[PDB]
Design a protein around this ligand. Structure first.
Ligand code: CMP
Ligand code: CMP
Ligand code: CMP
Ligand code: CMP
Ligand code: CA
Ligand code: CA
Lengths: 432, 450, 446, 446
């Protein structure tokens, strides 16, 4: 690919993953090789092979993948290769990349290789955008930060133990067994501030422990607090619904509402939360911009509003206007959507579920059982003066979602299109 | 006399009631767990004991004389108060609180702290006094820290009493975990007995550790419960203490809110250094003089009727000095304080310029404003405080040249705060009071002449 | 053919019946596997209980085959559809694996560990109980405490199993040798391991130090798990207990905000007490919570049913209501707003145009003259006033203004309806307008 | 004779000058008195530092007497007015007592404890620096770390002072004997006491156990105030970092909510990809913040005038505003609102009613016709469009309807102006629409 789009390219995400893996190798293996005596003349060949592969991928990123990256300027996307190279040159990312790639055997000589963290942040952002359920990845990265802090403390403790005599004092590391595990054990006890270590004796040991405990309390608290923030943000929606249901139940128990009404309210809350995944989506709708909210509305409801019997092909623009105006609220089963006596003030379109028109002697009979993608209630709204009542009672055979159009909004769109208004009223009169 | 729960006399009785309750809460468990404490000061306990029961008896009488609100009107009839009180569960709890243990006191022993455990049932009276104090206290955050600190000390005190009680049952000197043998010179005294128990309870509850290892199966169970209590219940109290600090953070966020939010938008745009400096200099003032950015949000909490009255007393000096105000009945004042909007003006900033249609009444709460000519070389006059200007533009004046346009431009001499009132709103004020219309008519025509 | 309703009370009962064998298997099978003395003392007790758990598990397969699901908003009673729906789920594979007897493939805990896979019913039972319980706050505390105790119990069994693998008494870290009578019995070995696990997970104290390199790995693993998961469950418990007192906090948080306002503004001490007294009234009667914000999620129809039943006594006293049309009762309760007035406050002033009408819910109002001591008529509970200003009367003496000022005696709660909203109800139902106008004509003659 | 301005930067510079001697007096006076070796070894250093500090304390008397105050919005140059403001308040009595001579041993530091009373200038500098600094959160953390380090330093001095009263080496709890060479040198004494206090205050533990009754009371008291410190460290530091990242967290919460709405509505991928791209466009360019939300607290006159500065390039490019040279621009810019359109989205379409006029800020908009592949005209940033439709003209082919489709070739940022606000501008100036009509006429036949 001559042009790579940063936002959507799975190949770019994979390359960012590879660069992050190389950077993680450098940033994790530099302290170990600097402090521990894990670098031998036999192992040094393997170390140089791995470092050569990491340097090769660091070089290839700048050479190819960062050179070929599409950009926008003034709302215009640019594909031209020379302009792409110029834009990559005119960036902070290129400066950071070159600063990391400067050459500068001492294992601490490769220290400037860890300056490449723009790649880590962009890889985090790309995986966070593409991958669903990213809260588990947030947890993973936070606990990875904590484990890296423990690793540095384990290496610093071994460095201090090497600077002093090994086994000279009780605090200093004696040397028996695997070196990394015991130093990591010292790190876990001090950073989590558990306690129980042998007491320092020499002034150097005392100042080491004092600084380690002080940095430990502040940093460990921050890392734990970030983990609490992440898990709270993960559970925030369930907490929101639980708080609303708790408040409603407490209020309705305080005011001694009857148990049947309490059970119906609880059932409505439970069903709407399981179905919708949210309560009162209108607030999220108003946080989103007007054009995006409208486009979402058209995309979700065009099939339902277009496949109706009343207004089929009359006016595409009026279809869009009703797509703006429509709202939805779940109706509980056996509830009366409308009653014959009540004056009709709303038009209902069935998104899902089944409603039954009730007509007959003493009612209690079903004339037509309406299904999804149908309309009812037009007679009361569209009449001579609007004073005509509902012809028949309509009930929900079961849980159903209706699209509600207000009388005022529908009349407002009717005054702009009297020609389609004429056909709509003609059909409403033919029904009777 | 019949007490009023809203009255201050009932509040002082609640604060008096907590002192016998605290003695009942803390000393009684200490006396039961520590045998040397009871026998050491047997005379001194009985004097404080009888005072506690007599105070509990007096609390019964006060309950019968405290009125209850029916239909928004306090009830002073003692007969109907007593009928309500005996129906409530509090009277049944209060009867058991002072249920006489003297009939079984002598049989069990000379004096038994364990028999007076029914005094614990008066604890809801203490919690009510904590709620009433917190609402009317001058410093709320200081009381919440003090209240949470009192709960910490009581919990540690109860745990320290239980540790000594279990040590005596197991036997002193049995192992390292239990209390040491009294044959040791230091641990003979009673003062060491409590301090060691309190020190032992502090180490576990505050998660410090550094405790002798348990050696018996009973001791392992006690440490599991103490460790489990420390991890959740203690962390809950400290979790509430951090919220009190966060409440102070929110109050600090209430002072000059969104200060950093303004900076980051300004810095990213970097439109001008001089306009940024004016914004910073204005924002820096309001930290010094300590103006609240918006008082309307604060008054929104109060009801509408109480919203107007509170705003009257704050600005009473300004309202009286205005020659319009207090025409008759002192009733126009309640209407106008709600409709007025506060505004702050920077020096050299023209409140309204010549040739512009002005919609704001511009009464002067504070600060000196000098009306000036369009050239600005000469100022016609300066208005000290409590004066009106620009009123000609709103009122319709016969024979007025450029009635919508402002005849003069006014510039604020120093820092100033103003109350601005919309044109349509002022017509409503004039419609209610004919005298206010006359004052605008006579004053507005004179300045047009000169 | 029997179809069980998922939301019915019979299905909720069966959730409790299946949950207890799941909880029995999750807590006691690992203890029986690790502690060898637990079975050999109590072989007859576990054999009877384990057969009970097996019978409930297989009966759960039959019940889940007869459970109903919601299709097109309607509960499904077709048995063929219920069978076709269940089999395709992954959950049917897990419940099948719970009942397969590994013994046919000795009686011991390790061969019965496949029954742990049926844990889905336990979590569903906790979710369903929390919604239907009286106080969900105290239940969610108990649910998180149960997770705390299970983790400690499981970690105690792992430590005893690790000690048996390395050996008993080989080093200080492991449990000392069982052969010694002091340490060799069931009561001490579970209890000390419970003490060891509680101290390690909570990071509160110091165990005897590890000796071997494998023991260092387990201690590091236990400490990190305790901080990452056990501490997080603990922090969730502490926050939600503070959420119980948070209901007192936001009403207080209003009070601290405004008290700081009059302290800076140097409000007079006489008006200091009036705001405090008003605030003390609100929390005494617990009226600081507003139903408009707390019921905004429910639709208009469900809000109407709640509003009628809450104020049933007051709405029955209104003259405009109990009418045959009944459209006023549904429509007006959403538009009505409550307001509380201080004693001595003027509800309305004589000679002022009124934008609203008022209905008494609680309290006493008296219409007064200029002095305010004299009273003409007492406004009782449920009375509606303000009709003269909103509705024009023919030949009005006051010119559509309020005839007389009304002063409140004691605290009163008023329901206010704006004139524009009332005028909408006037246009839809003409008869409701006439009965209010007829009442106004009688009071205009007075 | 000069009057310092409280708002001036020279006053802030003096605030830094006064703060260092106060901080030196707090940290070192309690360390000089408790440690006898510290005062003897560096006796020449303390003489110079104390003399330097004492002059700055005295110099604060002259500055505070000449510090201005704002009465009636104007600062006062009168010496009598400045003197009467400060010589009467409580701070003058505290400040005089800070600089009283100690003649009534002078070189010893327990008699110079009266310099601690001037803590008002210390707290004012930290409060003033928070507003002036560019990064308040990091400075707030640095201020809090300084506060904690003072108590630890103060606790170390008290612990050594207690050990000197009881005696060194008489029990395990106290600091060991000074006569022993290992514990003799001053660096060992100060570090270990600092090490001791940090362990006790932060509830680390590992301190030697107390022996005598007097030591029990001090250790218990240190632990109780220690958990107050731990609440601050967990509370303040954790909240500052959480509030530091509050901007990102709000945007991430919005993305998850829209994604959840995507699944429930079964939205098509092409729309879902379009939604996440437009969100990613805002996040990269950092335009997701809205200026009208932030600037709503700031008063209107300054708020309106900063808005003309941000959009000055676009407003100057407007031919309508530049040619008329009237005063309608100052009010319309506040009414003007921003809108962002994705590429391929038609801003306007023929046959659609128009209620707003749009002025391009940064976008290559096209006047498309028919399918939209061909463009009737090309539109550039700074060119207003749609004003023929909303202003109805008698000599028009069509009324309140767009004559041609307007589409965005790329991501376009534009500003929307509603019809009602333009009507407000017409009441100020009616001549603008007649000039726009003549330009609007020539579009009709072309
Ligand atoms: N015979 C019928 N067939 C189909 N729909 C009907 C019939 N009678 C009534 N309805 C619908 O039921 C609605 C009840 O209220 P409306 O009279 O407003 O409008 C009515 C129609 O939409
Ligand atoms: N010489 C003056 N003395 C007092 N007030 C003035 C003087 N000149 C102008 N004003 C006020 O300044 C206002 C400017 O706008 P108006 O013309 O609406 O009304 C004017 C008066 O209220
Ligand atoms: N003498 C009276 N008896 C009963 N009600 C009255 C009397 N005077 C006034 N009111 C009521 O007080 C109301 C005040 O405002 P209105 O004039 O709108 O309508 C008035 C009546 O409802
Ligand atoms: N030929 C053209 N040249 C320049 N601008 C045009 C042309 N045709 C249409 N427009 C602009 O595109 C706009 C589309 O909507 P309006 O018809 O409201 O107003 C229109 C003009 O502003
Ligand atoms: Ca510890
Ligand atoms: Ca700890």
């Amino acid at each position: 690919p001559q042009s790579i789009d940063p936002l959507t390219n799975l190949m770019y995400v994979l390359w960012l993953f590879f660069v992050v893996m190389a950077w993680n190798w450098n940033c994790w293996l530099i302290p170990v090789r600097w402090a521990f005596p894990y670098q031998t003349p036999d192992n040094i060949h393997h170390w140089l092979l791995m470092d050569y592969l990491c340097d090769l991928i660091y070089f290839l990123d700048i050479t190819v993948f960062q050179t070929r990256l599409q950009f926008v300027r003034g709302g215009d996307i640019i594909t031209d290769k020379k302009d792409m190279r110029n834009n990559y040159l005119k960036s902070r990312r290129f400066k950071m990349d070159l600063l990391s790639l400067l050459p500068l055997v001492n294992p601490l000589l490769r220290l400037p290789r860890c300056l490449k963290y723009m790649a880590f942040f962009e890889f985090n952002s790309r995986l966070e955008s593409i991958l669903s359920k990213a809260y588990v990845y947030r947890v993973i990265r936070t606990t990875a930060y904590l484990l890296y802090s423990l690793h540095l403390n384990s290496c610093l403790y071994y460095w201090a133990s090497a600077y002093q005599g090994l086994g000279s004092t009780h605090w200093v590391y004696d040397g028996v067994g695997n070196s990394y595990i015991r130093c990591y054990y010292f790190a876990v006890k001090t950073l989590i501030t558990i306690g129980g270590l042998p007491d320092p004796k020499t002034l150097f040991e005392i100042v080491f422990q004092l600084l380690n405990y002080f940095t430990g309390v502040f940093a460990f608290s921050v890392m734990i607090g970030q983990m609490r923030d992440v898990v709270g943000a993960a559970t925030a929606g369930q907490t929101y619904y639980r708080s609303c249901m708790d408040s409603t139940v407490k209020y309705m128990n305080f005011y001694k509402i009857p148990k049947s009404v309490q059970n119906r309210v609880k059932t409505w809350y439970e069903y709407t939360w399981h179905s919708q995944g949210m309560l009162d989506e209108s607030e999220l709708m108003v946080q989103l911009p007007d054009k995006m909210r409208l486009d979402l509305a058209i995309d979700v409801n065009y099939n339902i509003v277009s496949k109706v019997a009343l207004f089929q092909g009359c006016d595409r623009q009026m279809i869009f206007d009703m797509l703006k105006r429509l709202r939805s609220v779940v109706y509980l089963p056996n509830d009366y959507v409308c009653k014959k006596g009540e004056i009709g003030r709303e038009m209902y379109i069935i998104q899902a579920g089944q409603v039954q028109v009730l007509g007959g002697p003493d009612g209690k009979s079903v004339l037509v059982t309406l299904k999804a993608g149908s309309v009812f209630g037009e007679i009361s709204l569209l009449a001579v003066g609007g004073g005509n009542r509902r012809t028949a009672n309509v009930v929900a055979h079961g849980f159903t979602n209706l699209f509600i159009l207000d009388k005022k909004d529908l009349n407002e769109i009717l005054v702009h299109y009297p020609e389609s208004q004429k056909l709509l009223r003609k059909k409403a009169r033919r029904m009777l | 006399p019949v007490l009023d729960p809203s009255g201050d006399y009932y509040y002082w009785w609640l604060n008096t009631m907590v002192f016998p309750v605290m003695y009942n809460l803390i000393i009684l468990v200490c006396r039961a767990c520590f045998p040397d404490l009871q026998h050491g000061y047997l005379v001194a306990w009985l004097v404080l004991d009888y005072t506690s029961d007599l105070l509990y008896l007096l609390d019964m009488v006060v309950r019968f004389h405290t009125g209850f609100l029916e239909q928004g009107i306090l009830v002073v009839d003692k007969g109907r108060i007593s009928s309500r009180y005996v129906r409530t569960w509090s009277f049944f709890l209060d009867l058991a609180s002072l249920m006489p243990t003297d009939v079984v006191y002598v049989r069990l022993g000379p004096h038994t702290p364990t028999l007076r455990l029914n005094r614990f049932l008066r604890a809801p009276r203490l919690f009510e006094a904590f709620d009433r104090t917190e609402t009317r206290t001058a410093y709320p955050n200081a009381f919440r820290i003090a209240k949470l600190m009192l709960y910490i000390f009581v919990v540690i005190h109860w745990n320290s009493c239980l540790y000594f009680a279990l040590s005596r049952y197991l036997g002193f000197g049995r192992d390292a975990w239990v209390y040491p043998d009294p044959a040791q010179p230091g641990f003979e005294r009673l003062r060491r007995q409590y301090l060691y128990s309190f020190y032992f309870s502090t180490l576990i509850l505050t998660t410090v550790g550094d405790t002798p290892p348990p050696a018996r199966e009973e001791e392992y169970l006690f440490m599991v419960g103490d460790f489990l209590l420390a991890v959740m219940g203690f962390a809950t109290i400290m979790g509430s203490m951090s919220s009190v600090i966060y409440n102070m953070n929110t109050a600090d966020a209430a002072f000059y809110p969104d200060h950093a939010l303004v900076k980051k938008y300004m810095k990213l745009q970097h439109v001008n250094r001089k306009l940024e400096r004016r914004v910073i200099d204005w924002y820096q003032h309001l930290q010094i003089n300590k103006k609240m950015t918006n008082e309307v949000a604060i008054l929104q909490h109060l009801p509408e009727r109480l919203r107007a009255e509170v705003a009257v007393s704050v600005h009473l000096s300004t309202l009286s000095r205005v020659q319009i105000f207090q025409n008759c009945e002192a009733s126009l004042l309640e209407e106008l304080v709600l409709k007025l909007q506060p505004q702050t003006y920077s020096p050299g900033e023209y409140v309204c310029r010549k040739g512009d249609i002005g919609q704001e009444m511009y009464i002067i709460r504070e600060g000196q404003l000098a009306v000036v000519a369009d050239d600005g070389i000469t100022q016609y006059a300066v208005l000290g405080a409590g004066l009106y200007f620009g009123e000609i533009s709103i009122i319709n004046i016969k024979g007025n040249m450029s009635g919508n346009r402002r005849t003069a431009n006014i510039k604020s001499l120093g820092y100033s705060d103003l109350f601005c009132l919309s044109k349509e709103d002022l017509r409503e004020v004039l419609s209610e009071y004919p005298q206010a219309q006359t004052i605008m008519e006579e004053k507005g025509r004179e300045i047009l002449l000169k | 053919l029997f179809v069980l309703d998922p939301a019915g009370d019979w299905y909720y009962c069966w959730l409790f019946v299946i949950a207890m064998p799941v909880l029995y298997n999750w807590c006691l099978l690992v203890a029986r596997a690790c502690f060898s003395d637990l079975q050999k003392g109590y072989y007859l007790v576990w054999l009877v209980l384990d057969y009970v758990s097996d019978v409930v598990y297989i009966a759960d397969l039959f019940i889940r085959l007869r459970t109903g699901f919601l299709e097109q908003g309607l509960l499904v009673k077709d048995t063929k559809k219920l069978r076709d729906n269940y089999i395709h789920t992954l959950q049917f594979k897990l419940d099948v694996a719970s009942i397969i007897p590994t013994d046919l493939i000795i009686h011991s805990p390790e061969v019965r560990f496949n029954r742990l896979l049926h844990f889905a019913r336990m979590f569903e039972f906790f979710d369903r109980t929390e919604t239907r319980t009286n106080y969900p706050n105290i239940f969610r505390i108990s649910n998180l405490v149960l997770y705390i105790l299970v983790i400690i119990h499981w970690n105690a069994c792992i430590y005893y199993a690790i000690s048996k693998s390395i050996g008993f008494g080989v080093d200080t870290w492991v449990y000392p040798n069982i052969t010694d009578p002091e340490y060799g019995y069931l009561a001490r070995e579970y209890i000390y391991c419970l003490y060891w696990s509680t101290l390690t997970l909570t990071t509160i104290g110091e165990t005897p130090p590890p000796v071997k390199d494998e023991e260092y790995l387990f201690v590091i693993f236990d400490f990190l798990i305790g901080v990452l998961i056990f501490a997080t469950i603990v922090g969730n418990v502490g926050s939600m207990i503070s959420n119980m007192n948070a209901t007192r906090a936001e009403f207080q948080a209003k009070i601290d905000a405004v008290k700081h306002y009059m302290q800076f503004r140097k409000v007079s001490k006489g008006m200091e007490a009036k705001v405090i007294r008003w605030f003390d009234y609100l929390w005494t009667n617990k009226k600081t919570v507003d139903e408009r914000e707390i019921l905004k999620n429910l639709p208009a129809k469900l809000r109407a049913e709640i509003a009628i039943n809450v104020h049933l006594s007051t709405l029955k006293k209104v003259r405009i209501f109990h009418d045959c049309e009944a459209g006023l009762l549904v429509e007006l309760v959403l538009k009505l707003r409550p307001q509380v007035f201080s004693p001595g406050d003027y509800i309305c002033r004589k000679g002022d145009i009124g934008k609203e009408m008022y209905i008494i819910k609680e309290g006493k109002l008296a219409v007064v003259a200029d002095d305010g001591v004299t009273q003409y008529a007492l406004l009782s509970a449920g009375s509606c006033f303000g009709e003269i200003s909103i509705l024009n009367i023919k030949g009005s003496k006051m010119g559509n203004r309020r005839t007389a000022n009304i002063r409140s005696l004691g605290y009163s709660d008023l329901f206010c309806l704006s004139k524009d909203d009332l005028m909408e109800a006037v246009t839809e139902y003409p008869d409701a307008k006439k009965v209010l106008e007829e009442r106004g004509r009688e009071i205009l003659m007075k």
